[PDB]
């Protein structure tokens, strides 16, 4: 994993947020519950 | 498995689980935070 502090989330240029740092070691745990995926293209027809 | 349109590979495909997947994420680094005085009232939190 990689950590960034200067953030432009929602990509809106002109305005960026700098997240301050968090003290000590960080830990968190989450239920993965869904996904967002993209397919491919025509390529070979029906092979895979 | 829901997608507005699957024939359209460009349409993102959204998935819903019946079972949650656990994930354990850490920043395994005990972090110092310096607070820097740029004020009056303005203070910047750096990393020690």
């Amino acid at each position, epitope marked *: 994993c990689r950590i960034k502090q200067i953030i432009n989330m929602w*990509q809106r*240029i002109g305005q960026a947020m700098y997240a301050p740092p968090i003290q000590g070691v960080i830990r968190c745990v989450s239920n993965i519950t869904g996904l967002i995926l*993209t397919r*491919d*293209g*025509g*390529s*070979t*027809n029906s092979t895979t | 498995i829901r997608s507005e349109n699957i*024939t*359209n*590979n*460009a349409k993102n495909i959204l998935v819903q689980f019946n079972t949650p997947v656990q994930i354990n994420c850490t920043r395994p680094n005990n972090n110092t935070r310096k607070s820097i005085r740029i004020g009056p009232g303005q203070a910047f939190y750096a990393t020690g």
Partner: antibody
Amino acid sequence: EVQLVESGAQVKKPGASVTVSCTASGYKFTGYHMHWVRQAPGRGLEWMGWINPFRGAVKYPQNFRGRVSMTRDTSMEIFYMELSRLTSDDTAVYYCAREMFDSSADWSPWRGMVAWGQGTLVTVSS
Amino acid sequence: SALTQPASVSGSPGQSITISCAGSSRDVGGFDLVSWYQQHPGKAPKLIIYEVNKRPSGISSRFSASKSGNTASLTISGLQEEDEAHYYCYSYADGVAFGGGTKLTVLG
């Protein structure tokens, strides 16, 4: 007016890789898909992929996958495209082109390309 | 190319001509994404038709297109010297399919 303005034509050795710049203007840059298309001399058109300028999503064909690197500089409004491992077969005039409507619309990005780069001639010979 | 076009078509100036684009049910038949492009020699291509029968703004009423089953057809009426160019058909087939391109000339 919009305007797709591409880079200058380039004369290159085989085996190498080459990028093409294509700078957009005259519309909401980040909202519109950009296709890249080569056209080998006298031949038909080879669709090489596309980018969505919002966060940079892409999709290439199976033929062109691996060799193609397609990007954009939202800050500067420049699209970049790089075919790599150039062979004599990779000699073509390379275009960038924009689909009819913005990304918010339905069925974008598969409608039809309107604005057209001037073509960039890339020549692969030994 | 996955879409099959005539190699060359000859038409007398002023007449009416038609260009065919045939594909599987995967592209032409099952979709209305047929679109056509004109390209003058040594120039960038230019969109002409889309959604099987749609003219972008700036396309003369002489130009029209349609699809009949798995075979779409492009038609030009009252031809004129400006139309001597290369013409390629397009349809979406999960990726991007393309017609081989047809050359337009003068007949007689």
